Amino acid sequence: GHMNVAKREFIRGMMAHYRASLPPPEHSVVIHELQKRVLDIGMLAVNKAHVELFGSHVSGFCTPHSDADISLTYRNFSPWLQGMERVDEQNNKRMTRFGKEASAMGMEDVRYIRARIPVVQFTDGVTGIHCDVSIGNIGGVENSKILCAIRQVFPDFYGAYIHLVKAWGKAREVIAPERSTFNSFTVTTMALMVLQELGLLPVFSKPTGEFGELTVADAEMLLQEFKLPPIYDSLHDDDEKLGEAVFFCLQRFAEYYAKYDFSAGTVSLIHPRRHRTVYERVVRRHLELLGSRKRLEWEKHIAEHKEDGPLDENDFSASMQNETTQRPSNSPYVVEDFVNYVNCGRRVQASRVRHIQQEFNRLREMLIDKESELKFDEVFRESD
């Protein structure tokens, strides 16, 4: 009798889902030990092995089950050489030995994937966590650190919001990279852009990177100073109150992307709503800078390894083409990675747009229009 309580229960259920997903107290020790295990494998396969984690276990937007992204570097590694045939060949020799050593040390389901960009995938033989190892994923490491810094501002606020977006995204196949929809990183970035638009995160409008990209120190510096509205100071000890703030943000998120004009606009944390064509210009500038430095490093390698010379213009051209095809401004979605201007949304196929748009429609309808009918198990119902 005017006694509907759907919204209250939905907020309660969603904050409980968040709380249930959080890694236990000792999880940082678990992940640290995982890093050491992988380093042990690394030290067998390559000289001066160095292992960096990235992805959600670094950002902190994770569950204890979240997979692990790992970046392997070595003596005289250069981020600028990947693409050069001879060095790609060498990186394959490193990953081939890495895969064998990982099997020997007791990693399960080890799969070495031979390619110009080689990767080794496996299930950790201690935790069961799925691991992805690649050489010198410098962008990955850097953007994960920025995301970590963002979360640090108010971990449970940003944490719950992102968690629920992802949980929804996965259930509804909006986050399904193998089905040609979004990956988690791309939707995370999207969700954060809404927070920026709401004044709940600063805009990173001053990238100072050598190639015009946003750096970790750029981000940390802005966030150090950033203030949330004063009300947020009373939300740290009560999930009913905090859940009202996260609920409002989820509403805004759903509505934002059910309505966002992607024909004109991109998603960016550096410049929210920046036009596709301006992103194009930024990309073109970025690629000139990248190309100059790339060629310079290719020459430096050849000077030290003459039998790999002379510089192969065809291969160098192909490498630059690969940089270009990573940053298209005309794909169904353009979601900008702030550390390298890569379009991380580029793989989403035109035929998938309907499903993505429809799921955002459904989410908006449920969170806003049919608020009185809210049921957590319905909103986050697994697709099919």
Ligand SMILES: O=c1ccn([C@@H]2O[C@H](COP(=O)(O)OP(=O)(O)OP(=O)(O)O)[C@@H](O)[C@H]2O)c(=O)[nH]1
């Ligand atoms: O398009 C991409 C995808 C991924 N990445 C880089 O790889 C990392 C992992 O990419 P994921 O999409 O797995 O991000 P995640 O760890 O936040 O997702 P969950 O596993 O929790 O579902 C990200 O943190 C980013 O550094 C990109 O740079 N671009």
